[PDB]
Amino acid sequence: AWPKVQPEVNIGVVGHVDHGKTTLVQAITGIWTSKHSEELKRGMTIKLGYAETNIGVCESCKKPEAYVTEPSCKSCGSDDEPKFLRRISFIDAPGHEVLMATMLSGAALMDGAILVVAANEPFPQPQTREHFVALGIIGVKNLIIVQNKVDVVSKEEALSQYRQIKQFTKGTWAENVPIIPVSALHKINIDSLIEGIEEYIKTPYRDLSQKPVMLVIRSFDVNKPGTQFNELKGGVIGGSIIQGLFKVDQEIKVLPGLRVEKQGKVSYEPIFTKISSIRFGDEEFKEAKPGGLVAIGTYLDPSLTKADNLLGSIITLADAEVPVLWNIRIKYNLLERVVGAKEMLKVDPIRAKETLMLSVGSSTTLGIVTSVKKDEIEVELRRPVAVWSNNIRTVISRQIAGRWRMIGWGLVEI
Numbered sequence: 001a002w003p004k005v006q007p008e009v010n011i012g013v014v015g016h017v018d019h020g021k022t023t024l025v026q027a028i029t030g031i032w033t034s035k036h037s038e039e040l041k042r043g044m045t046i047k048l049g050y051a052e053t054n055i056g057v058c059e060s061c062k063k064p065e066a067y068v069t070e071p072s073c074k075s076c077g078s079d080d081e082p083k084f085l086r087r088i089s090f091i092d093a094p095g096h097e098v099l100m101a102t103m104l105s106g107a108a109l110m111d112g113a114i115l116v117v118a119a120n121e122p123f124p125q126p127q128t129r130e131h132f133v134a135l136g137i138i139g140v141k142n143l144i145i146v147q148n149k150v151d152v153v154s155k156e157e158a159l160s161q162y163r164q165i166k167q168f169t170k171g172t173w174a175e176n177v178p179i180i181p182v183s184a185l186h187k188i189n190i191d192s193l194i195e196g197i198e199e200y201i202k203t204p205y206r207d208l209s210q211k212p213v214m215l216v217i218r219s220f221d222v223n224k225p226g227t228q229f230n231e232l233k234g235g236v237i238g239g240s241i242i243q244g245l246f247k248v249d250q251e252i253k254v255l256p257g258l259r260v261e262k263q264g265k266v267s268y269e270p271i272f273t274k275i276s277s278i279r280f281g282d283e284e285f286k287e288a289k290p291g292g293l294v295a296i297g298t299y300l301d302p303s304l305t306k307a308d309n310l311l312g313s314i315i316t317l318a319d320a321e322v323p324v325l326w327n328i329r330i331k332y333n334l335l336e337r338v339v340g341a342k343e344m345l346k347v348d349p350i351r352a353k354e355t356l357m358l359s360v361g362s363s364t365t366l367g368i369v370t371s372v373k374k375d376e377i378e379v380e381l382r383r384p385v386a387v388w389s390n391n392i393r394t395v396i397s398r399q400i401a402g403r404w405r406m407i408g409w410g411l412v413e414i
């Protein structure tokens, strides 16, 4: 039998709208990540999607077909159980340009990534570019490029596009990144993609001695409708542990925390609670480590966690020392061009008093520029941001023609 463990690695799935990210995740895991009614109605990913799968290999069989996502080797004529390799998980990002900030959030949770490129659309599309560049900036460089939808084009058309992708990646950090052609919809050449995942997205080393930090992207509660208040189960906080590990019964805090109103005046106070449960997908555990999206059960009033209220927060141990900042200094660099725009645009220098969007961890916050220098800016934030380390990368976006576009990045200076 295969062991039941948490996923040990997160693989992002990114790319331009409708290029087939969610269908690819389904082809690999059997799971459709879109859970929300609006997503299903509109036929699009809006919030970050999630799915897990075990990965194994039939040692007596030929690759890539030997790779499996279930404990069976009958597909290669063997009655033996395949060797369990690891459990993996996917962070499924929205492709729509208006949702770039959500991709950025997701990128903070990724150990590696798949960039999905549709073989039947002209490469490189705006969000192909924007997602690629974002991955590069954030440091998600264990990348596989997947040519999807090859089922609707000839081999030669696909090869033409392949050449284009090689041209695009040449001279960049991704010059030697593999390109794997598949059909996500009709499930063709998926085995080669599994093989590629095993080869190019190794599980990263984890320093379990680092202080526990979790980036929050979800919050909710399991209580069925018509439940007595005095017997409601506590709120649940979902996210990914980026360092250290958490354990059941640990005293934790949510930062920046809760919005407090004192007659118009608005401040933030840390939310202290205790871990009552730990779950990955459908399985319970006593501890949670990096890799996978974890659901942290708590003793919080469900009203505090309702409807992903805590998105962008972080969770640490109760006694951790973490700056919660309403002003930040950033050592920055701007892109030459607004890569996510349809028409080519040069990035204008940062100006004092302009409003910028800052992506830090899973958080997205607007701020006003209070100082501009060649290598540094200072920003007055509309809401505070938790800065858990000294080398955190932020992504900078600017509103151009009514659309928030990535224009640069920086290090948050402590």
Ligand SMILES: Nc1nc2c(ncn2[C@@H]2O[C@H](COP(=O)(O)OP(=O)(O)CP(=O)(O)O)[C@@H](O)[C@H]2O)c(=O)[nH]1
Pocket: 015, 016, 017, 018, 019, 020, 021, 022, 023, 024, 043, 044, 045, 046, 093, 094, 095, 096, 148, 149, 150, 151, 152, 182, 183, 184, 185, 186
């Ligand atoms: N012919 C073909 N169609 C595909 C393939 N993969 C996905 N599609 C189709 O493309 C459309 C969008 O697929 P979907 O997986 O939702 O794409 P997405 O990139 O996740 C959309 P979003 O960017 O909003 O998250 C669907 O109609 C789907 O059936 C493929 O390999 N071949």
Ligand SMILES: [Mg+2]
Pocket: 021, 022, 023, 044, 045, 092, 093, 094, 095
């Ligand atoms: Mg999708």
Ligand SMILES: [Mg+2]
Pocket: 150, 151, 152, 153, 154, 155, 158
């Ligand atoms: Mg083809």
Ligand code: NA
Pocket: 028, 029, 030, 052, 053, 054, 069, 070
């Ligand atoms: Na599976």
Ligand code: NA
Pocket: 107, 108, 109, 110, 111, 112, 140
């Ligand atoms: Na990472």
